[PDB]
Design an enzyme around this catalytic site. Structure first.
Site, mmCIF file in Angstrom:
data_model
loop_
_atom_site.group_PDB
_atom_site.id
_atom_site.type_symbol
_atom_site.label_atom_id
_atom_site.label_comp_id
_atom_site.label_asym_id
_atom_site.label_seq_id
_atom_site.Cartn_x
_atom_site.Cartn_y
_atom_site.Cartn_z
ATOM 1 N N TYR A 186 0.850 -1.207 0.000
ATOM 2 C CA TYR A 186 0.000 0.000 0.000
ATOM 3 C C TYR A 186 0.866 1.230 0.000
ATOM 4 C CZ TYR A 186 1.071 -0.094 4.989
ATOM 5 O OH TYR A 186 1.665 -0.192 6.248
ATOM 6 N N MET A 193 1.131 5.483 0.982
ATOM 7 C CA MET A 193 0.750 6.331 2.086
ATOM 8 C C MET A 193 1.087 7.795 1.841
ATOM 9 S SD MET A 193 1.903 4.684 5.584
ATOM 10 C CE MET A 193 0.882 5.740 6.625
#
Ligand SMILES: [Mg+2]
Ligand SMILES: [Mg+2]
Ligand SMILES: [Mg+2]
Ligand SMILES: [Mg+2]
Ligand SMILES: [Mg+2]
Lengths: 243, 243, 243, 243, 243
Positions: free
Chosen positions: B139, B141
């Site tokens: 992921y 960020m």
């Protein structure tokens, strides 16, 4: 307060390799030659100082290729786009992202006694020949208008002082990165386009990160997508599209 | 403050099974061999310590396969992406998501008396051989810049204290999960990429949930999409793509 | 408070150049004729003062062509749209963006003593013949409803004083830009459409930037996408679509 | 604090009816039988208590069909998804949405004296046989982290108090609805999947609306898309797909 | 508090005119007959008081056609959708938007002494025959849950006094507009659907704008997309799809 220069198009495209590979070899070579003939027109224009262009390959899926085009009118940008789309190669160059803006200058020594559009030091920023660096980065941005972080509700003085620190951070990258600021309020979806040119792609990261700790960027910066790429020399176009 | 290492490309694709199934068998088999021959190049490069890669199948519809590629230059990421896309198999590997970033280190013991780019215990982090774990999670960020939760408006001391807790949560997962942090400010749409590697995919949920109760994450974390996957070693490629 | 005039459709399309090029020449030329015959009916309507239209090419990838149509009923907008879609050319004019709205006036001397819908100086604004300027700019907008910036929670008095600055900014651009405001609350996704017409595209950037420093825009403006274009008179249609 | 059970995939698809209808009838029948043969495997797995599944038709255009699959490993989810995609029917089951998560329990009697993964009353919740109710509802959720409404910055004790009312609202629907909570932090884009099963679809609306007046939901709930469906008995598959 | 009535599907489609024009004329004629035969079944159902429907053409690119369907069960919505999709015409009716909800009544005189589901004046509204007006407008909405504008954190009496103003604005449009409110909490992506029927489309814009100055809408209203259309009489279907 700003002086406006050349209109700017960033035209990003994704390559439809699957379709391109089904085109017979003779039609591919013809398409490459057609596209190179078009870019030759662009090079004549840039040699005559009537516009400029940059062609970079973009890493990742947001795009494969960027054509950044500066011209004296919005009509000419349209003409260039249309000519491109009418080439056979462009059938394989699918839409990815675009940006329409105008080169904008705020910082210059204003005496009142001269038309700054006729001063050499100014014109060479209004009507820039784009740098042929190893790398490019583009991103658009807004100045925030949210709650107590509203740029446009600040005083002139407050804006000026905020922009000082911003200038100070840029000065740290003299001779390492060059930045073309284009304005797009009223022309496209954000307020400015930022195009960085460098021989060292790490400097995009160093510079944009260091800027983010200046109050103008921390509190007032809203950023779009970031596109980074590597220069495509026209000598390498044939091999790039070779299948 | 950070040391920068290899450039990183996360390339996620969706598989066009229906089209693939139309390609004649002999041509599917030739495409699989052609792809394996390309990854075999990547493996030689890793063996030579001139880059690394990871190939995982991704669960769900956000993507089907991830190629994560570390190389010394952004140019080599371009070359790899291009080579991949010129393969036959890549015609059936449709766009899904991508990320462009650079391995980034902040924590090292700095003495002054050495070039840290030549210290073994730093080089092996800058230029990592990626874990060959059963699972991966990726992921991206940002650090938040909203209202009273503005990371970039904090003091250096306030950030250092906040990052303490975060470091301490991580220590709890020593030997269970490894994390590769890449920086993408100026390079892609978020500020960091986070790639986790574990032989137990529950550890991703445990770790990321636990972190979320640290103030740094709770107040200052902004997260993109999460992708989780299972290793696809090359010996399994033929069976995975078989139809 | 507002007087309502002609309904308005902004219909933006992107050209499928690749598919268009595969259509045999004779059929492309017959398509261009059919399309021109259609626009000739529109011109007949407009010369009878029973509506108006404009056709602009749009710069960039957000769209390639805009048809802006004004008619007395919503039904007529549907019939125009439908008749365009049943042309051959429209098969190559893919969806890009659209907007449905009604010409809205708030500014007129209201005496009570006349039906304003009958006053010639009001009518010519309710039922406008659209400018034939070199350029166009379209964007939608909302008035903000967020926190302490909630337009609709203000007093009538505060809104009036806010809008007076906005009108003063507009006055600076008399005879350089004309602006058609359409209302769309209850009809489309934003609250107003803004269409600007000028022979100098820079005036869009100048005007919209300058307005953003008015409190009403700075605090209460929410903007959609901005589309800019160049006029496409019917005499230029065969050349524009030629391949 | 939480115990982790089976992994869960929600796989939503849309049906390409137009293409399906072009496929020759004897190929449609074979494709249905092939699919039913797959589901027969899933049924054997569920009979052996080594997974569970649910198949629902989804109303509206967000999807047409949902396969909800619970298995002991992430690899098993990938295997099931891949097998499904390699069926001929799946060529007509286009992507719509998906969700990857793990059955999670927070509420259980913790003695210390036992391994709760071996206790029958806990096992049946970790490893649930999905209900074969007339209706299903799925939505993902996050706990808010904004401003003064930050779930993860509350105390343990404040969280426990908030969750109490939430538990009390649920208890109202005993016998009427059952809820499978799956955790997805680290695994997919939101923090939890919520799957509701009922024989009365109105109870979804009643429950979810009533929950929304609890402070935990009103202040800290953030919701994704909601998908509601009717059970597709395997005896009705042939008729549903019949054209 | 609410009484629930018929379930409601709003099914919006975009017409694939290019593909439709390639279908032989006889197959187009048959497809139109088939569709007309379908809607005749819907008309029979409405006449038996077992459902209701409305068919409107939508202006703009958000959609071309809306089928709004009320039935006693969610299963029946599924059946109608499926039967529609299995028609030949529906192959050319591509996805655009959809909404699933249930007719919901809060305002009724409650005595306690009657089953309201059996009372004529209540049944009339739970199980409504949709208006055959010249125009329709659809949009979804939420009630806001943000900062100090959190609807669900208000008291019941605060909500009551807010809704009073809302009701009073509506009473101003008695006989001009009728509004079908459907609740979709737990059923779709927003909390209510709002469908408005009028013989003057301008009344949508007047009503919705006037509402926005009510505190309940100004502070607590969150709106989705707005779709506006014109009634499509079945006698006009053949002409409409004629190519
Ligand atoms: Mg194109
Ligand atoms: Mg591709
Ligand atoms: Mg079309
Ligand atoms: Mg598929
Ligand atoms: Mg369909």
């Amino acid at each position: 307060q700003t002086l406006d220069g050349w209109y700017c198009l960033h035209d990003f495209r994704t390559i439809d390799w699957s379709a391109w590979k089904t085109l017979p070899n003779e039609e591919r070579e013809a398409a490459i030659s057609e596209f190179l003939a078009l870019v030759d027109q662009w090079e004549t224009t840039e040699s005559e100082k009537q516009g400029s262009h940059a062609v970079y390959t973009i890493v990742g899926q947001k795009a494969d290729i960027l054509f950044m085009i500066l011209r004296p009118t919005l009509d000419e940008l349209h003409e260039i786009e249309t000519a491109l789309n009418k080439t056979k190669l462009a059938d394989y160059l699918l839409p990815a992202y675009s940006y329409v803006s105008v080169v904008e200058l705020s910082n210059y020594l204003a005496s009142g006694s001269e038309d700054p559009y006729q001063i050499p030091e100014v014109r060479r920023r209004l009507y820039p020949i784009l740098p042929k660096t190893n790398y490019i980065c583009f991103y658009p941005m807004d100045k925030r208008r949210q709650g107590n972080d509203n740029w446009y509700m600040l005083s002139m003085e407050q804006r000026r002082e905020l922009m000082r620190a911003h200038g100070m951070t840029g000065r740290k990258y003299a001779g390492k990165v060059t930045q073309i600021i284009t304005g797009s309020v009223g022309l496209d979806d954000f307020e400015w386009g930022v195009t960085l040119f460098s021989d060292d792609a790490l400097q995009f990261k160093k510079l944009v990160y260091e800027m983010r700790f200046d109050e103008v960027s921390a509190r007032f910066g809203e950023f779009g997508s970031f596109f980074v790429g590597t220069r495509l020399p026209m000598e390498n176009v044939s091999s790039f599209f070779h299948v």
